[PDB]
A paper describes a structure:
We also present the crystal structures of AhbA/B from D. desulfuricans, as both an apo heterodimeric structure and as a product bound complex. Native crystals diffracted to 2.23 Å and the structure was solved using 3 wavelength SeMet MAD data. The initial structure confirmed the formation of a heterodimer of AhbA and AhbB with two heterodimers in the asymmetric unit. The full sequence of AhbB was correctly traced in the structure except for the histidine tag, which was disordered. The majority of AhbA was also identified with only the first 20 and last 10 amino acids in disordered regions. The linker region for AhbB consists of a longer loop region the flexibility of which is inferred from the poorer electron density observed. Finally, the C-terminal β-strand (β6) directly hydrogen bonds to β3 of the opposing monomer to form a tight interaction. Superimposing the entire AhbA/B dimer onto AsnC using AhbB as a template demonstrates that the N-terminal domain of AhbA is angled towards that of AhbB.
Here, sirohaem undergoes decarboxylation of the southern acetic acid side-chains, attached to C12 (ring C) and C18 (ring D) of the macrocycle, to give didecarboxysirohaem in a reaction catalysed by sirohaem decarboxylase, which is composed of two subunits called AhbA and AhbB. The AhbA/B complex is a heterodimer formed from two similar protein subunits that share a near identical fold. Both proteins consist of an N-terminal and a C-terminal domain joined by a linking region.
Numbering used by the authors:
A (entry chain A): 22 to 166
B (entry chain B): 1 to 159
């Protein structure tokens, strides 16, 4: 629930918030609005949680980072220890208990394929549980919208 | 990160990965916190936006036109000759958001084509599984139903 100027503003700032010294003045000139009103409107939409975040979103691969999907057959007696060693890694962003023999599925991001492998080997060493390192070699569909 | 960026550049990037300073001149505020000029801030952000290192420089909004809910992680058996064909065909579906090919040398894990399925009711997700079976050569599969979300975090590239 907002006005057409907020819809036009959000249509611009989603593609690109202006990379200029006075960006709200640049938005004001494009929208036919006073510089301060555009700041007021952005603050309001942020406060109402319509704007989640205003900043940079990176493309991991272009920063020299590699990503993988990891899987393990975790027995009930090793569960709490394994889950804790996995979650203690900052490179792990997603961890899930899944309905299969391979019941622990997690994402691991790091600067290289060698560092990711050393992290996985380090986990196996502490828990006694082997891990499948499954990087993607081909991408057909990706969600960001 | 030290190999691609100067300490000052990394300082700008540590802030922008969170939020832009809340003012009329955010690039001047970035410049003073990092030990750079405003023009240098703009050149760094412009360079990474141009190269694609910054996929998006702006606002993250609540969804777009998305409601809820049901997710379905399904892994399929695939031979090398089927890969591109099955990949491209499975990805043409509206209810699928992720299609990955992840080779596996593990004897007890023969599934390598991954489709992330969406929609509503459990049966609608099972329906897209039937849609993939009629529209592709993919047959044998494993449904990896989420039982518990153990960690959901965002990656911090600049520490």
């Amino acid at each position: 629930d907002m006005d057409s100027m907020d819809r036009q503003l959000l249509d611009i700032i989603q593609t690109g918030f202006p990379l200029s010294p006075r960006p709200y003045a640049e938005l004001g000139q494009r929208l036919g609005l006073d510089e301060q009103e555009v700041l007021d409107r952005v603050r309001g939409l942020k406060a109402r949680k319509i704007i989640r975040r205003l900043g940079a979103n990176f493309q991991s691969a272009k920063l020299g980072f590699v990503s993988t999907l990891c899987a393990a057959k975790v027995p009930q007696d090793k569960m709490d220890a394994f889950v804790a060693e996995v979650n203690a890694k900052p490179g792990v962003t997603h961890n899930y208990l899944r309905e299969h023999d391979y019941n622990i599925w997690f994402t691991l991001i790091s600067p290289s394929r060698e560092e990711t492998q050393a992290i996985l080997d380090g986990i196996t060493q502490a828990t006694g549980v082997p891990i499948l390192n499954l990087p993607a070699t081909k991408l057909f569909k990706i969600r960001v919208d | 990160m030290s190999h691609q960026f100067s300490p000052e550049e990394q300082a700008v990037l540590r802030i922008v990965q969170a939020n832009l300073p809340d003012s009329l001149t955010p690039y001047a505020d970035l410049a003073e916190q990092a030990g750079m000029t405003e023009a240098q801030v703009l050149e760094l952000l412009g360079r990474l936006k141009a190269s694609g290192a910054i996929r998006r420089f702006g606002a993250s909004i609540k969804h777009q036109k998305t409601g809820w809910t049901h997710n379905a992680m399904v892994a399929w058996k695939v031979t090398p000759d089927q890969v591109d064909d099955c990949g491209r065909k499975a990805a043409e579906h509206s209810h699928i958001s992720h299609v990955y090919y992840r080779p596996s040398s593990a004897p007890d894990w023969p599934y390598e084509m991954y489709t992330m399925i969406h929609g509503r009711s459990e049966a609608e997700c099972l329906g897209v599984v039937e849609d993939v079976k009629r529209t592709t050569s993919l047959k044998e599969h494993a449904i990896l139903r989420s039982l518990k979300e153990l960690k959901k975090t965002s990656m911090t590239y600049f520490t």
